[PDB]
Design a protein around this ligand. Structure first.
Ligand SMILES: CCCc1cc(CC(=O)O)c2[nH]c(CC(N)=O)cc2c1
Lengths: 121, 121
């Protein structure tokens, strides 16, 4: 759930998930259409696709446990859903960090009509 | 599209394409520069080269259909674009499978800044 994902985001980026990654570009937020606008937006797109591979799970509400070992995020053994969701979240938070150099405020509060089209995954 | 490619990757490798191959090395992800890290990364290098030779198509977004006959992927009879994209994808999924013996977790979540330089196809 956002509790765990958000914690990862803050730990990796020094930004609060809401609002730094909740209205950015076409994919960092909710709703899902258009061409990702930059590297950070691509992280989000990949994150959605990652969740998309888990139709029997519910990442909005599925809580899971993760810990830090040797400085790195470790998705603790749980259910298949918990582990897979955790790995999705971990990959995205690290992707956000790796791309902080191009994080652009111009993409925050990004309008709907600038994001058209369906990009299947 | 990513949808079909991911399905082939799962069928051939047993791994979910995102996140197992979506951040791997220099070429398994967005873009690509530098020397591929290993066999798996070369699979993605080649895949990129294959897509790059489909300028009359939209390889990441174009939908196509395929089937499995006698245990192996068979690209349908579809449009010229659909058939070629399918074959690029098939070659890559099989390449991943053939090289699972050297797939290395250390190349997951690979930061793009570590990949520099033109490696012509
Ligand atoms: C579903 C499969 C995994 C994976 C991920 C990405 C996704 C995005 O373009 O980053 C990919 N992008 C490409 C691009 C193309 N140049 O080969 C191949 C590829 C493979």
């Amino acid at each position: 759930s956002l509790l765990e994902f958000g914690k990862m985001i803050l730990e990796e980026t020094g930004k609060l998930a809401i609002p730094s990654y909740s209205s950015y570009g076409c994919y960092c937020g909710w709703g899902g259409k258009g061409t990702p606008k930059d590297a950070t937006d691509r992280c989000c797109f990949v994150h959605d696709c990652c969740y998309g591979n888990l139709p029997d799970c519910n990442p909005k509400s599925d809580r899971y446990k993760y810990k830090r070992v040797n400085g790195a995020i470790v998705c603790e053994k749980g259910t298949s859903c918990e582990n897979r969701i955790c790995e999705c979240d971990k990959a995205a938070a690290i992707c956000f960090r790796q791309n902080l150099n191009t994080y652009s405020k111009k993409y925050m509060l990004y309008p709907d009509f600038l994001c058209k089209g369906e990009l299947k995954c």
